Design a protein around this ligand. Structure first.
Ligand code: H6P
Ligand code: F3S
Length: 314
């Protein structure tokens, strides 16, 4: 467990955010209260261990509301659903509980409010991601418009109907440094545009990036615990890599390759927002097998935010 060659450092904060803790408990609590099966639309969170653990408990993960039988209980995932998907669930004989992150619902509601006013909306976000369908699918007014931008270059190439009546929003897990450049480009291009002071990047995302930066100034190699389809986890690995360090996104301790830490003197470990602590604890045990000493957590920003389950799920 505890003395050896290679130092192990743990980023702070790392691992579960308020939204993911809430989402998991909505699924656990529905299973404990109503019994298996409970249907969840898509993975509740982008972590295969969390998804497999709930499956064991009796959660059924489906792709389409059309796979859910009448009379069932269905949960929307933490990443949110479009208005279409919600109405479709409303039209069916189903009890729905919604695990959408409150901080995502926040962004959904600003897109819906723009549609109602005929204002065009720009989302900063990555194409071909689940969170994006959800958020873009809050916009329904055909007089207006809804556009996705990924880069300052996309802002420069964008053409809009009425630059005078424009709003922007952003996904919640994006790279803070890269979103800042995009928003600077938007506000210069469109100085009357309205959006939030800074972005709609959530506190967990911002904190985990700040922590991985601090981590990555000290360690040669960075391990980010999270699944390949977790965009926040991926942003953490990428930050470290962009600081010139080898950085590995790993689902669990078994993905660790001895070469990655051969002759390494400081290895840093973090966890995306959907990765449970038992995964990190297993990584640390594996790193110790490989010569690591005691894991030292870095000092870090305190997080104190909690989102409660719906009262009917306590
Ligand atoms: C629900 C949510 C984040 C929790 O982390 P996840 O890893 O589940 O999702 P993401 O990073 O969006 O791929 C906000 O999209
Ligand atoms: S949007 Fe919500 S699910 Fe976590 S990564 Fe941010 S608090």
């Amino acid at each position: 467990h505890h003395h050896g060659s290679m130092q192990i450092l743990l980023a702070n904060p790392r691992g579960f955010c308020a939204g993911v803790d809430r989402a998991i408990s909505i699924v656990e609590n529905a299973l404990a209260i109503y019994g298996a099966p409970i249907y969840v639309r898509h993975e509740v969170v982008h972590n295969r261990y969390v998804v497999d653990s709930l499956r064991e408990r009796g959660a059924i993960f489906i792709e389409q509301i059309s796979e859910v039988p009448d009379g069932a209980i269905l949960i929307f995932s933490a990443h949110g659903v479009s208005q279409a998907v919600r109405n479709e669930a409303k039209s069916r004989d189903l009890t729905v509980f919604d695990a959408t992150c409150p901080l995502v619902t926040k962004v959904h509601m600003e897109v819906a409010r723009a549609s109602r006013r005929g204002e065009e909306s720009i989302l900063i976000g990555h194409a071909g991601h689940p969170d994006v369908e959800g958020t873009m699918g809050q916009y329904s007014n055909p007089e207006g418009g809804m556009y996705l931008v990924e880069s300052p270059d996309d802002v420069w190439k964008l053409t809009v109907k009425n630059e005078e009546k424009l709003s922007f929003m952003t996904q919640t897990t994006l790279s803070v440094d890269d979103t800042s450049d995009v928003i600077d480009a938007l506000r210069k291009r469109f100085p009357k545009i309205v959006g939030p002071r800074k972005d709609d990047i959530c506190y967990a995302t911002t904190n985990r990036q700040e922590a991985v930066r601090a981590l990555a100034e000290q360690a040669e190699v960075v391990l980010v615990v999270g699944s390949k389809n977790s965009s926040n986890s991926n942003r953490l690995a990428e930050l470290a890599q962009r600081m010139g360090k080898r950085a590995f996104l790993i689902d669990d301790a078994k993905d660790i390759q001895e070469e990655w830490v051969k002759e390494v003197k400081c290895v840093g470990v973090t966890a995306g927002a959907s990765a449970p602590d038992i995964l990190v604890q297993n990584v640390v045990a594996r790193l110790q097998q490989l010569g690591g000493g005691e894991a030292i957590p870095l000092e870090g920003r305190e997080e104190n935010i909690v989102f409660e389950v719906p009262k009917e799920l306590r």
